[PDB]
Design a protein around this ligand. Structure first.
Ligand SMILES: Nc1ncnc2c1ncn2[C@@H]1O[C@H](COP(=O)(O)OP(=O)(O)OP(=O)(O)O)[C@@H](O)[C@H]1O
Ligand SMILES: [Mg+2]
Ligand SMILES: [Mg+2]
Lengths: 581, 590
């Protein structure tokens, strides 16, 4: 509980307001001007009599009183800044208004209305006391009276202005700026625009960050530029398709993993050049335990570094098992889950920003070899998702592997009759070289909630309508197809990336890293390449991509609500901060 | 314009504010406490020099000054009543706060921020003039400052308390209910925090923005009617069943000779609020006066369709999907094939839509759902006939009132679990139609799994027993499968609280908390005797504790689960957003 009150010429308010609540308060802050008429001795000694509670005094520098428009506006700005910087982090505070002359009272009431307060109140005394003993006497005789105005909820979008400026290290008139005036003007302009127009008044198709200033919305509508790298890095992101085993394939990551026991190339290649390039890690190296643990920690640190708020990781437990060391695939997967949940809990305990990660069990399409491997992987995933306890868990399986006409979705469909029965989820990888019939059956036979790549949807309008109406997601990684196919004005390759057309059509497109290491680029860089690779892309479509990514994730309903709330708050804060610079 | 002021020790701050606008002011109305320090004669002399400016004087009778809680609250209620009485009809009043001690200034400022004011401001003078020949040179020298903090729109529609609460200038604190106190006391869960659809709801003033979270009550009938709604499970054949609608459709027949005017469905006490549970057979027999025995006539069908569309527009519906059975209305004697009947319905609805849109009025875009019934008395080839007819109507293509998809429904006695009729549904999805399924009205929760994973049904009719199959509820939520539910019909044919001798609770609240994309519909309008508005409003005494934001998110869910194209969905969402914003701003101005 926090009490905020204004100080004018006399010290009536602070003690009577402090004791006005029977329980008392814990922190009390008082605002005052540069006038020398006020004395800080009485309040200081009274609060030193009870050191258990907190107390502070804030003085408006260079302003003894209000004498003109500039004086009043500067005083109001300083009061608003003090209220904002003394705002309790979660709960609303209490406000006493009886301090100062009527102009301070009105400004403080306006501040309470705008930023919200728990229960504002008035304090009046008939005898006009002077000193502590007889404040206590008048309180004992019952002459004390508290007048309660009400409970102001305030603008929830206004309380998030502490990020732009907590304090400007004691700003002076030479470098003064009216930021809270910017806040009030943005809210009044938004309301007036709502009440005046109808077109812009109804358009509003997005997660209720619409309380942004109109200038911010206009900046958002502008096409995305290559210089928005800082903003996009500051933007919280989601990576729904990342491979654990392809991280330490280049740079010092591989050396660190071994000891702990490009990317804009214009070469068009067709497979096996990521497999052999990444052969330095994965099956050959991660057989032990220390290498796997170091790889997991490095991947989590990289994910947190890029401000990613949620990710789904596809791993190959059978590729890492070592029977000679009594290291079964189930043991490897349990180790992965345990280290990920330990890292998540460790980050959460520090209250620092953390990246929730869920695991997807891959089902490698080895084709002829060991046909029982598909059944083994499916059963492993089914029984592994049932461990229950743990922030990190298994939410689905994967169907990646060697894609072929014989390896179509109608080849393994005998084994998937129970994956949906037990409540799992299925993704798929098709369309890069397969037939639209294969994609259609994968959508309708395997009931694949998501889908990998399939850049040639445009050639099948019927299948495009089928995927759009069923809200089947698409995981398409710009760097992957840039290195594989011809995009981003690739020489001798006039093909253009269908991400723009996918967005206009309405396909829930998610941008992913695929494999960070071999591609040598993170998800932020993946978003930047869309600027020059796809001309005429606006900054709003990036947020649409983020929303689609968090909508197509295999997550629970309540977890989705939590992620949506956090993403809304973070997007609001980062946009409000970044519009200034 | 009208300006309002309140002051204490100072006597003529009102003339000081009278020069705030260089063009001038038109009306002055001052309200103050009964203290003698205010001088009314000086203001009277000042305003007598300007006859064109109305000057009305009112005082807080019986209260010299605020001294305790009771005096403060009495002054506050009197001031609120005077404010909502004296505000201009179409313009926000002017108000100034240059005078008065903390209590009245705070009360009037809080009142202004609730209703609204054209401009609240402060006027302070450097030399604090005592007499008028002093403030003349005070304003001439520029010492007087027009301190203005900003425009105060307030709640652009809150003044209905002027009329819903009768204007009573002469009254005391003994009789007043602070509705604002109830609407303010409890404001600040994840659900209501971030579950808001329609982004513009965030723009609303905090009073309304929190009002939407209060529990729904039966007194919100006007508000709930004024919202644009969506109906997805509506049966054309059950629209007109008795009364004036039946008389009109009977009178519009081409041949009135063969119209059975003798039959009349029996009455049920308290209908639609049934005094006891009813069976499905009696529920259908209640609609025996209409259906297919009377709809064979072309004129009857045209009248029924036009009347149904008029009712839909009257109920403020903005989008609807109509379930119809074209084969049931076919007659080979008059060359009335099922395709001809369906085509005629399509042209009639398209003509109505175009004629309503050309006049820039309110129209509800309507699409048809064909019904592939369970085909009582065998003869299951009719399923294939219905599917072929639906596909042909689908790639007919051109038009406005298109065909969205098919529907499977019928009796549960045959024990059909989407496996008997699965043999023919495969070809539907190739064309691009959509499939619903009336699954699990009173049956086991097994067949729903087949309807979802083999029929690929994108919606589920009723499904009131989903709460007992958590494994099924998980995949229902995870696949984004809509669940159409009809409150009045299910209550009548199954029985729910608060109907005595019953203990089952309607699962709508738990369905919404879990996250099922539930959309509330009306089923058969005529038989149940309740339109969409009454069906939505019955949730107050059907599911206690339901909130208005839950109703808005129900409308959003109905928008989500409807079979429409992406662009049309975007336009519908924009229109719904704007309209719903205007409704929550203006209708609850009460
Ligand atoms: N689902 C989540 N994903 C990521 N972070 C979360 C999640 N839920 C809660 N948090 C964390 O809750 C914390 C709340 O922080 P707060 O609202 O006080 O803003 P802040 O500390 O000023 O800045 P920041 O959000 O960067 O921490 C955030 O740091 C956020 O990382
Ligand atoms: Mg991949
Ligand atoms: Mg029905």
């Amino acid at each position: 509980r926090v009490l905020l009150c204004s100080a004018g010429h006399s010290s009536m308010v602070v003690p009577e307001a402090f004791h006005a609540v029977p329980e008392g308060f814990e922190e009390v802050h008082v605002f005052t001007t540069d006038s020398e008429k006020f004395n800080p001795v009485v309040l200081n000694d009274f609060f030193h009599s009870l050191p258990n509670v907190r107390f502070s005094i804030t003085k408006c520098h260079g302003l003894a009183d209000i004498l003109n428009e500039r004086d009043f506006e500067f005083y109001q700005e300083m009061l608003w800044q003090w209220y904002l910087t003394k705002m309790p982090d979660n709960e609303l505070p209490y406000v006493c208004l009886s301090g100062g002359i009527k102009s301070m009272s009105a400004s403080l009431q306006k501040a309470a209305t705008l930023f919200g307060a728990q229960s504002v109140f008035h304090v009046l005394a008939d005898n006009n006391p002077r000193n502590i003993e007889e404040m206590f006497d008048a309180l004992q005789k019952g002459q004390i009276h508290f007048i309660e105005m009400g409970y102001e909820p305030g603008w929830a979008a206004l309380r998030r202005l502490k990020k732009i400026l907590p304090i400007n290290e004691g700003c002076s008139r030479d470098n003064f700026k009216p930021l809270i005036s910017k806040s009030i003007e943005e809210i009044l302009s938004n309301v007036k625009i709502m009440a005046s127009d109808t077109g812009k008044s109804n358009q509003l198709p997005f997660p209720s960050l619409a309380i942004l200033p109109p200038i911010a919305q206009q900046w958002l509508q502008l096409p995305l530029s290559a210089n928005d790298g800082a903003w996009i890095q500051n933007l919280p992101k989601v990576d729904l398709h990342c491979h654990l085993g392809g991280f330490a394939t280049s740079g010092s990551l591989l050396d660190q993993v071994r000891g702990a026991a490009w990317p804009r190339s214009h070469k068009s290649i067709s497979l096996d050049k990521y497999m052999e390039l990444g052969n330095a890690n994965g099956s050959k190296l991660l057989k032990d335990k220390g290498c796997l643990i170091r790889q997991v920690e490095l991947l989590y640190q990289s994910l947190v570094n890029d401000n990613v708020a949620y990710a789904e990781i596809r791993c190959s437990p059978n590729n890492y098992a070592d029977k000679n060391k009594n290291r079964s695939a189930w043991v490897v997967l349990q180790d992965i889950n345990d280290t990920f949940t330990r890292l998540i809990t460790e980050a959460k305990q520090k209250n620092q920003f953390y990246c929730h990660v869920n695991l997807l069990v891959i089902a490698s399409r080895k084709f002829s070899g060991d046909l029982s491997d598909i059944s083994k992987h499916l059963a492993l995933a089914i029984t592994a998702m049932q461990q229950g306890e743990g922030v990190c868990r298994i939410v689905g399986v994967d169907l990646a592997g060697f894609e072929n006409k014989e390896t179509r979705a109608s080849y393994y469909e005998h084994d998937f009759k129970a994956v949906h029965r037990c409540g799992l989820a299925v993704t798929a990888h098709a369309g890069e070289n397969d037939d639209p019939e294969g994609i259609w059956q994968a959508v309708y036979s395997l009931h694949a909630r998501r889908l990998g790549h399939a850049l040639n949807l445009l050639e099948a309008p019927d299948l495009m309508r089928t995927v759009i109406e069923r809200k089947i997601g698409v995981e398409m990684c710009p760097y992957a197809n840039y290195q594989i196919k011809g995009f981003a004005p690739m020489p001798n390759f006039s093909a253009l990336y269908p991400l723009k057309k996918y967005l206009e059509a309405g396909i829930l497109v998610s941008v992913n890293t695929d494999n960070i290491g071999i591609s040598g680029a993170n998800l932020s860089e993946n978003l930047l390449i869309l600027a020059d690779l796809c001309p005429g892309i606006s900054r709003m479509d990036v947020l649409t991509i983020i929303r689609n990514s968090i909508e197509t994730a295999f997550i629970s309903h309540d977890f989705r609500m939590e992620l949506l709330k956090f993403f809304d708050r973070k997007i609001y804060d980062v946009c409000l901060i970044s519009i200034k610079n």
